[PDB]
Design a protein around this nucleic acid. Structure first.
Ligand SMILES: Cc1cn([C@H]2C[C@H](O)[C@@H](COP(=O)(O)OP(=O)(O)OP(=O)(O)O)O2)c(=O)[nH]c1=O
Ligand SMILES: [Ca+2]
Ligand SMILES: [Ca+2]
Ligand SMILES: [Ca+2]
Ligand SMILES: [Ca+2]
Ligand SMILES: [Ca+2]
Length: 902
DNA sequence: CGTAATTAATTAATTG
DNA sequence: AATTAATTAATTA
């Protein structure tokens, strides 16, 4: 097989590499890598190396990496550019793997682990590690085994062995319900003392050294705790054994508070799953505890136990260990669904970077671009210092707040990356500037043509047309991968809807789910067989379809993120190819494109309807337009339609056969106007929205910019079995909004768009009536807890203290003096509740750590003094008032003449 | 060390 | 309560 790296480090003058060799075995080598850097040389000197602008370079080959670094510094003292890859391990990888890497994941040791630490005096700080480690569960992907290291004897209690028999039993049998599919995969090792547990863990680590190290909060807790505990007991050199090269870096981090240190293990790639989740999930959660995320992702019940965690080992060691193991499994279950490890490996190997560098799109793009240029013997420019400067972004249209009955939306495919490709925007393709006219002059096609030679953006930039820049070339490659996966995602989604339809009439039999590839639209024979399936088979298939869709979604959305991050990197000072002329050429072109096509769409529809000056485009943001279709529907008459799906078909057909051709013509003209390299402005139909035929639903509404709701029947080719609410920006979409309120507001909106005014009034009346029975967590607001210290004056709110910070300060006073009560962690999330006047907490609100029950000491008082009236007005009535006034509806039935009868 | 546009909630100070 | 400036949090794209 083809070889691939596992890990790479620079340690002084050595590269330490772990790799899989041609036979599929893991090896390590230390290489005295001799790096090369480059300097400009005279034009009349023969060389094969050129910088990105075509200037000739001479190669400087150094005896070691230290000399290369010292040369860089001397070139600074002289005042001359030092060209080439200054990150020597990336040059090493490029030299050693001068080909497209084909990796085999089954050869990569992916370790998932978690530790338990009993602590009587509060949270066990990793940098102190003063408490014994009493449990470690370490899953190894190669063995497919959970290795359980259990401490039977501790200063905090002596316990009996964990029983795998009880662990397997149902909770109703007094067991721990450890999933049966992992029971056989557990290797249980009990220990008489902590020293031997840790010594054996380290020997184990030595034999099964993680390549990818993951788990939940392992970067901030497990890794620092284990390192420091071993350091405290055995000395530093023994702790360093967690690195295969015996080198570590301790950093008492310095950017915004937090002096609790993170440990870098050389020769290991740490991908903390919390960080993977935060970057790649496209969620913002109210809480990031494993219980909360597990429940959200997998629909598994919370891990339940009596008493505080500080007494769990002592009171119920059996459950203590069982839950440690389950915790480890849950991360694996989340990854089976989300596939962030797969994504990280794909991205890392494609770019040829340390896998952990996937968190940095700048590093990722620096390496991709470097490798691409190196292929042609081109030399990358030196990184430079830049002051941070603001620059202009997208255009957002001010919508008229209103109900909108029939809406067809259109959307530009992968806009900013397509602009890069269309215009040919790259550091080395800059050809010059032209004299800009005001933007609206380009929008209206009255400004003079920017250039008859070069490809142009309305910000004034000109680009060469003779050849594609490295940025367009490389962004194109990742875009095409993205497109392939989006195609799989959409097919799985369409397939999901076929299954839902068939679920309306399940057959009465014992059968099995069909063995199908869900990434492809079901064939006619599959569709026929589905119509004969049982509910159980159909449900399992739906689950599988939806799992395929999620897999597709991860692969596609994160490749979209990567390409959009290349645009973003052009606007970040730490990017080697940072250039505000390029970033601004992209955004300015976007503003023109949107407004240009708004004008064209209005012109086209005014023609086809025989009107003049009618505004058909009601809204747009960045790259999307929302077109009112009321007149289109009214031209045929609602009476002609058999059902909802009939007008949805009509609009779908009108969009595809009439509007899209016109839209294409308009963008082709714009391309010629800007003299661009390639027409890549593709604006396809996104949404078809409207009320159910014959209903009193309003269909949709806008309250303002980035705040709207639509009742959608079809989304980019997916015809829904049930209409789906597309709600953007409103309180239902915000993690800060109480869960019960999100739900209730979503139902108000549903009733508005699908059923009408009366249905909404009926529901509101009921919600207001029953509101007070709702669980306190369900009606708590959520916020991030930043800068607590700044606003803390003696334990009371300082000037300008934010509402949620006040809540925290109240909480601190309430629990002050208690070492064991949950502390609010700076930068973490908190639940927030209003408090009625005259309460014992001495303020108007209380906040506590999110995802948790409030400590039992003050729970009864919070529940007693919760201000339900303030909660209702602030979180529910206020936004609903906003929705309904924008929609011209009343959430409460107003008086009428009819009130004088019966 | 990916980006900008934009919203709502909030505090402080004002709005004769 | 409204409006205005400044902060904060969180979205849409
Ligand atoms: C979501 C997102 C968008 N944008 C910018 C760049 C996008 O091209 C532009 C439009 O956003 P989107 O319409 O959300 O996405 P897209 O057009 O790039 O890709 P597609 O529609 O095919 O899924 O907004 C970012 O810069 N960063 C982001 O994270
Ligand atoms: Ca735990
Ligand atoms: Ca788009
Ligand atoms: Ca689309
Ligand atoms: Ca059937
Ligand atoms: Ca869009």
């Amino acid at each position: 097989m083809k070889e691939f790296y596992l890990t790479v480090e620079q340690i002084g003058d050595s590269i330490f590499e772990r790799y899989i060799d041609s036979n599929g075995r893991e090896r390590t080598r230390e290489v005295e890598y001799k790096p090369s850097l480059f300097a400009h040389c005279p034009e009349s000197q023969a060389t094969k190396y050129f910088d990105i602008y075509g200037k000739p370079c001479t190669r400087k080959l150094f005896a070691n990496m230290r000399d290369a670094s010292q040369w860089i510094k001397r070139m600074e003292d002289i005042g001359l550019e030092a060209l080439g890859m200054d990150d020597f391990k990336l040059a090493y990888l490029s030299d050693t793997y001068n080909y497209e890497i084909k990796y085999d994941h089954t050869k990569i040791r992916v370790a998932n682990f978690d530790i338990e630490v009993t602590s009587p005096d509060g949270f066990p700080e990793p940098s102190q590690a003063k408490h014994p480690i009493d449990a470690i569960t370490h899953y190894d992907s190669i063995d497919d085994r959970f290795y359980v290291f259990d401490l039977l004897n501790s200063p905090y209690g002596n316990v009996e062995e964990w029983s795998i028999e009880i662990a397997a039993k149902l909770q109703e049998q007094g067991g721990d319900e450890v999933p049966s599919e992992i029971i056989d995969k557990i290797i249980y090792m009990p220990f008489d003392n902590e020293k031997e547990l840790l010594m054996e863990y380290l020997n184990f680590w030595q034999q099964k050294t993680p390549v990818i190290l993951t788990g939940w909060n392992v970067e901030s807790f497990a890794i620092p705790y284990v390192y420091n505990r071993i350091k405290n007991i055995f000395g530093e050199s023994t702790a360093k054994r967690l690195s295969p090269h015996r080198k570590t870096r301790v950093k008492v981090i310095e950017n915004m508070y937090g002096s609790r240190e993170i440990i870098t293990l050389f020769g290991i790639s740490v991908l903390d799953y919390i960080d993977l989740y935060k970057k790649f999930s496209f969620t913002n959660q109210p809480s990031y505890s494993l219980d909360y995320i597990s429940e959200f992702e997998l629909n598994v019940g919370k891990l339940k136990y009596d008493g505080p965690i500080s007494k769990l080992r002592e009171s119920n060691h059996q459950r203590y260990i069982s839950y440690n193991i389950i915790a480890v499994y849950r991360v694996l279950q989340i990854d089976a669904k989300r596939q962030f490890i797969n994504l990280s490996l794909d991205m890392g190997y494609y770019a040829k970077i340390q896998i952990q560098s996937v968190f940095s799109p700048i590093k990722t793009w620096d390496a991709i671009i470097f490798n691409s240029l190196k292929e042609q013997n081109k030399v990358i420019p030196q990184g430079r210092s830049h002051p941070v400067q603001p620059y202009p972004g997208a255009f957002v249209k001010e919508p008229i707040p209103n109900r909108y009955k029939y809406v067809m939306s259109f959307d530009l495919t992968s806009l900013y990356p397509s602009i890069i490709r269309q215009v040919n925007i790259s550091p080395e393709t800059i050809a010059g500037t032209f004299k800009v006219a005001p933007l609206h002059d380009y929008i209206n096609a009255v400004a003079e043509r920017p250039s008859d030679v070069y490809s142009c953006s309305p910000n004034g930039m000109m680009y060469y047309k003779d050849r594609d820049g490295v940025v367009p070339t490389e962004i194109t490659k990742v875009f095409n991968q993205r497109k392939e996966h989006k195609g799989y995602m959409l097919a799985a989604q369409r397939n999901g809807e076929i299954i839902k339809e068939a679920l309306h009439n399940p057959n009465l039999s014992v059968d099995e789910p069909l063995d199908v590839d869900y990434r492809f639209d079901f064939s006619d024979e599959i569709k026929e067989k589905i119509k004969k399936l049982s509910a159980k088979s159909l449900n399992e298939m739906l689950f599988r379809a939806q799992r395929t869709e999620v897999a597709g979604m991860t692969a596609q959305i994160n490749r979209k993120l990567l390409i959009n991050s290349l645009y973003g990197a052009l606007g970040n000072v730490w990017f080697r190819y940072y250039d505000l002329r390029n970033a601004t050429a992209i955004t300015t072109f976007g503003q023109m494109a949107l407004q240009w096509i708004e004008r064209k769409v209005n012109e086209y529809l005014n023609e086809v309807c025989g009107t003049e000056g009618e505004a058909f485009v009601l809204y747009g943001d960045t790259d999307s337009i929302y077109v009112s279709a009321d007149k289109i529907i009214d031209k045929v008459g609602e009476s002609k339609f058999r059902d909802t799906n009939h007008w949805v078909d009509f609009l779908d057909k009108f969009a595809r056969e009439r509007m899209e051709p016109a839209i294409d013509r308009g963008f082709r003209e714009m391309c010629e106007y800007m003299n661009n390299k390639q027409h890549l402005m593709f604006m396809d139909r996104e949404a078809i929205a409207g009320p159910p035929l014959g209903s009193k639903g309003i269909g949709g509404f806008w309250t303002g910019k980035k705040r709207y709701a639509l009742n959608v029947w079809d989304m980019e080719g997916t015809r829904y079995a049930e209409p789906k609410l597309k709600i953007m920006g409103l309180e239902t979409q915000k993690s800060s909004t109480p869960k019960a309120v999100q739900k209730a507001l979503k139902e108000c909106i549903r009733r508005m768009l699908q059923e009408g005014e009366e249905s909404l009034q009926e529901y509101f009346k009921e919600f207001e009536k029953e509101f007070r029975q709702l669980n306190y967590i369900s009606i708590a607001s959520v916020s991030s807890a930043n800068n607590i210290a700044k606003y803390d004056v003696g334990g009371f709110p300082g000037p300008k203290c934010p509402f949620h910070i006040r809540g925290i300060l109240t909480y601190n006073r309430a629990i002050k003096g208690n070492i064991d009560a949950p502390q609010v962690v700076e930068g973490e999330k908190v639940y927030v509740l209003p408090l009625r006047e005259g309460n014992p907490f001495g303020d108007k609100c209380i906040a506590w750590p999110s995802g948790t029950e409030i400590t039992d000491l003050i729970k009864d008082d919070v529940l007693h003094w919760m201000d339900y009236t303030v909660l209702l007005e602030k979180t529910f009535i206020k936004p609903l008032e906003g929705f309904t006034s924008a929609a011209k509806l009343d959430y409460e039935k107003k008086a009428s003449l009819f009130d004088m009868f019966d």
